[PDB]
Amino acid sequence: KNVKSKIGSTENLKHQPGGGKVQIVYKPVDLSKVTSKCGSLGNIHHKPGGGQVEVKSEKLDFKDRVQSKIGSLDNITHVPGGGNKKIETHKLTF
Amino acid sequence: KNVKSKIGSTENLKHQPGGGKVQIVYKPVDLSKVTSKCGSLGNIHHKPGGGQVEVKSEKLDFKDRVQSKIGSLDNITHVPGGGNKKIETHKLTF
Amino acid sequence: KNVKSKIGSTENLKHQPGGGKVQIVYKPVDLSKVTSKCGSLGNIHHKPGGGQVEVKSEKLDFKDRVQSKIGSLDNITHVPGGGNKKIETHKLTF
């Protein structure tokens, strides 16, 4: 049970600005089997080449301007609680 | 049970600006089997070449301007709670 | 049960601006089997070439301007809660 509220707020939220989220799972399985029964065999050169995984962010020029003008917040009643009674907010001028 | 509210707010939300979300799963399976029974065999050169996975973000020029003007927020009653009674907000001028 | 509300708000939401979402699943299966029974065989050159997967974002010039003018938010009653009673919001001038 989440209650979230924003009244006249400025937010500049940034999750992982440059690189971001990089998830690399390098899990090859190698079960290359050689069976020789009642015979003859030469040399075994087993040279399986490794993978190359590269993730690059070269030149990034990010510019963000965030402006907020509120004249006045004045007269706010904000009740996110429960079972509350008799909540009053008065404002008079002159 | 989520209750979200935004009254006169400015937001500049950015999730993974540069790189983003990169998920690489490099999991090849190699079961190349050689069976020799009651015979003869020469050399075995086993050279399976690795994969190449590259993800690149070269030159990125991102510019964001966010402006917000509110004259006045004034007279707000905001009740996201439950079972509340008798909530009043008065504003008079002159 | 989600309740979302936006009254006079400015939002500049961006999910993965540059790279985006890149999902590469490199999982080849290699079951090339050689069986020799009661015979003769020469050399075995097993050279399966690896794949090349490349994802590129070269030159990206993104520019976003977001302007918002609200004169006044004034007199708002916002009740997303349940079972609430007697919620009043008064505004008088002169």
From Swiss-Prot, chains A, B, C:
<feature type="modified residue" description="N6-acetyllysine; alternate">
    <location>
        <position position="47"/>
    </location>
</feature>
<comment type="function">
    <text>Promotes microtubule assembly and stability, and might be involved in the establishment and maintenance of neuronal polarity. The C-terminus binds axonal microtubules while the N-terminus binds neural plasma membrane components, suggesting that tau functions as a linker protein between both. Axonal polarity is predetermined by TAU/MAPT localization (in the neuronal cell) in the domain of the cell body defined by the centrosome. The short isoforms allow plasticity of the cytoskeleton whereas the longer isoforms may preferentially play a role in its stabilization.</text>
</comment>
<feature type="modified residue" description="N6-acetyllysine; alternate">
    <location>
        <position position="33"/>
    </location>
</feature>
<feature type="cross-link" description="Glycyl lysine isopeptide (Lys-Gly) (interchain with G-Cter in ubiquitin); alternate">
    <location>
        <position position="63"/>
    </location>
</feature>
<feature type="modified residue" description="N6-acetyllysine; alternate">
    <location>
        <position position="14"/>
    </location>
</feature>
<feature type="repeat" description="Tau/MAP 2">
    <location>
        <begin position="1"/>
        <end position="21"/>
    </location>
</feature>
<feature type="modified residue" description="Phosphoserine; by PHK">
    <location>
        <position position="68"/>
    </location>
</feature>
<feature type="modified residue" description="Phosphoserine; by PHK">
    <location>
        <position position="21"/>
    </location>
</feature>
<feature type="modified residue" description="N6-acetyllysine; alternate">
    <location>
        <position position="59"/>
    </location>
</feature>
<feature type="site" description="Not glycated">
    <location>
        <position position="6"/>
    </location>
</feature>
<feature type="disulfide bond">
    <location>
        <begin position="7"/>
        <end position="38"/>
    </location>
</feature>
<feature type="cross-link" description="Glycyl lysine isopeptide (Lys-Gly) (interchain with G-Cter in ubiquitin); in PHF-tau">
    <location>
        <position position="27"/>
    </location>
</feature>
<feature type="modified residue" description="N6-acetyllysine; alternate">
    <location>
        <position position="85"/>
    </location>
</feature>
<feature type="glycosylation site" description="N-linked (Glc) (glycation) lysine; in PHF-tau; in vitro">
    <location>
        <position position="85"/>
    </location>
</feature>
<feature type="site" description="Not glycated">
    <location>
        <position position="91"/>
    </location>
</feature>
<feature type="site" description="Not glycated">
    <location>
        <position position="10"/>
    </location>
</feature>
<feature type="modified residue" description="Phosphoserine">
    <location>
        <position position="40"/>
    </location>
</feature>
<feature type="site" description="Not glycated">
    <location>
        <position position="33"/>
    </location>
</feature>
<feature type="site" description="Not glycated">
    <location>
        <position position="56"/>
    </location>
</feature>
<feature type="modified residue" description="Phosphoserine">
    <location>
        <position position="72"/>
    </location>
</feature>
<feature type="repeat" description="Tau/MAP 3">
    <location>
        <begin position="22"/>
        <end position="52"/>
    </location>
</feature>
<feature type="cross-link" description="Glycyl lysine isopeptide (Lys-Gly) (interchain with G-Cter in ubiquitin); alternate">
    <location>
        <position position="59"/>
    </location>
</feature>
<feature type="site" description="Not glycated">
    <location>
        <position position="37"/>
    </location>
</feature>
<feature type="site" description="Not glycated">
    <location>
        <position position="59"/>
    </location>
</feature>
<feature type="cross-link" description="Glycyl lysine isopeptide (Lys-Gly) (interchain with G-Cter in ubiquitin); in PHF-tau">
    <location>
        <position position="69"/>
    </location>
</feature>
<feature type="modified residue" description="N6-acetyllysine">
    <location>
        <position position="6"/>
    </location>
</feature>
<feature type="modified residue" description="Omega-N-methylarginine">
    <location>
        <position position="65"/>
    </location>
</feature>
<feature type="site" description="Not glycated">
    <location>
        <position position="86"/>
    </location>
</feature>
<feature type="cross-link" description="Glycyl lysine isopeptide (Lys-Gly) (interchain with G-Cter in ubiquitin); alternate">
    <location>
        <position position="85"/>
    </location>
</feature>
<feature type="glycosylation site" description="N-linked (Glc) (glycation) lysine; in PHF-tau; in vitro">
    <location>
        <position position="63"/>
    </location>
</feature>
<feature type="site" description="Not glycated">
    <location>
        <position position="14"/>
    </location>
</feature>
<feature type="modified residue" description="N6-acetyllysine; alternate">
    <location>
        <position position="37"/>
    </location>
</feature>
<feature type="modified residue" description="Phosphoserine; by PHK">
    <location>
        <position position="1"/>
    </location>
</feature>
<feature type="site" description="Not glycated">
    <location>
        <position position="47"/>
    </location>
</feature>
<protein>
    <recommendedName>
        <fullName>Microtubule-associated protein tau</fullName>
    </recommendedName>
</protein>
<feature type="modified residue" description="N6-acetyllysine; alternate">
    <location>
        <position position="27"/>
    </location>
</feature>
<comment type="subunit">
    <text>Interacts with MARK1, MARK2, MARK3 and MARK4. Interacts with PSMC2 through SQSTM1. Interacts with SQSTM1 when polyubiquitinated. Interacts with FKBP4. Binds to CSNK1D. Interacts with SGK1. Interacts with PIN1. Interacts with LRRK2. Interacts with LRP1, leading to endocytosis; this interaction is reduced in the presence of LRPAP1/RAP.</text>
</comment>
<feature type="cross-link" description="Glycyl lysine isopeptide (Lys-Gly) (interchain with G-Cter in ubiquitin); alternate">
    <location>
        <position position="47"/>
    </location>
</feature>
<feature type="repeat" description="Tau/MAP 4">
    <location>
        <begin position="53"/>
        <end position="84"/>
    </location>
</feature>
<feature type="glycosylation site" description="N-linked (Glc) (glycation) lysine; in PHF-tau; in vitro">
    <location>
        <position position="69"/>
    </location>
</feature>
<feature type="modified residue" description="N6,N6-dimethyllysine; alternate">
    <location>
        <position position="27"/>
    </location>
</feature>
<feature type="cross-link" description="Glycyl lysine isopeptide (Lys-Gly) (interchain with G-Cter in ubiquitin)">
    <location>
        <position position="91"/>
    </location>
</feature>
